[PDB]
């Protein structure tokens, strides 16, 4: 049909589209690839959607205003990054997703392969074989975090990249430890920042943000309606850690878990199966 077209064997090709959509308000960039598989020997259309970009951690360190909170400081930080794709149109369904299972390794690298005749296959690795007519990979780093499939069904998929276990001066600390990232400040002139672990102790997913890399394939019966809408959501759930310096007992910490849930940037897209195009809606 148009522009970036890759012949992947006889009677088959892939038409490659992209969209880049950012939100300074939400601190997100969606850099999405949408690859149409056009195979005369497959009775369905298929769109491989690869979701990359950036989700800002939105980590911050602040004073707490008001009487009784003069030596109480606040750290907001992402307990989980949220990535999902949802549709409501009867004419479309999700037929695969990557990662498909929980993955706890620091690096995640997986491949979705396609072979003529409607045959998809996924592997929890990169560089396995030259047996596919077309392949797409995902690659991301999640130091101290784990990836879980929060929801998966024929119409939606949602992954959570969630805080798990961290390296600290005093050893390994669980993501559920209320004193995680808490330290005694050096001087009562200690700014809010000084009540919390320095940057060199905060892993990238806490200090900076996350660069997603996820795939799901949308399936559409050839001949059904020309278009489908779907939404891609990227965001975070933030926790708060409050640290109070008491006169004689020292540093005291309290965690507000799931303090800000679903702070997500949702973009609605339209796929046109007939023209092999993608548009951003709204």
């Amino acid at each position: 049909a148009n522009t970036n077209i890759e012949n992947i064997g006889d009677g088959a090709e892939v038409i490659k589209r992209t969209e880049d959509v950012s939100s300074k308000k939400w601190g997100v960039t969606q850099n999405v690839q949408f690859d149409f598989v056009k195979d005369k020997k497959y009775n369905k259309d298929a769109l491989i959607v690869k979701m990359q970009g950036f989700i800002n951690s939105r980590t911050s360190f602040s004073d707490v205003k008001g009487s009784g909170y003069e030596l109480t400081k606040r750290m907001i930080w992402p307990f989980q990054y949220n990535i999902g794709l949802t549709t409501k149109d009867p004419n479309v369904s999700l037929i695969n997703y990557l990662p498909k299972n929980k993955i706890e390794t620091t690096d995640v690298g997986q491949t979705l392969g396609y072979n003529i005749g409607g045959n998809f296959q996924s592997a929890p690795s990169i560089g396995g074989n030259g047996s596919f007519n077309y392949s797409k990979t995902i690659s991301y780093t999640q130091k101290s975090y784990v990836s879980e499939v929060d929801k998966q069904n024929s119409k939606s998929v949602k992954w959570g990249v969630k805080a798990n276990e961290f390296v600290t001066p005093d050893g390994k600390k669980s993501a559920h430890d209320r004193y995680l990232f808490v330290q005694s400040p050096n001087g009562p002139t200690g700014s809010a920042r000084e009540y919390f672990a320095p940057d060199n102790q905060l892993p990238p997913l806490v200090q900076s943000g996350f660069n997603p890399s996820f795939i799901t394939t949308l399936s559409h019966e050839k001949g059904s309606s020309d278009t489908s809408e779907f939404e891609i959501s990227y965001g975070r759930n933030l926790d708060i850690t409050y640290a109070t310096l008491f006169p004689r007992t020292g540093i005291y910490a309290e965690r507000k878990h799931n303090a800000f849930v679903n702070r997500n940037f949702v973009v609605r897209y339209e796929v046109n199966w007939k023209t092999h195009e993608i548009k951003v809606k709204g």
Binding site: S60, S62, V64, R74
Partner: peptide, 5 residues
Amino acid sequence: DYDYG
């Protein structure tokens, strides 16, 4: 900053 900074 959630109106805290």
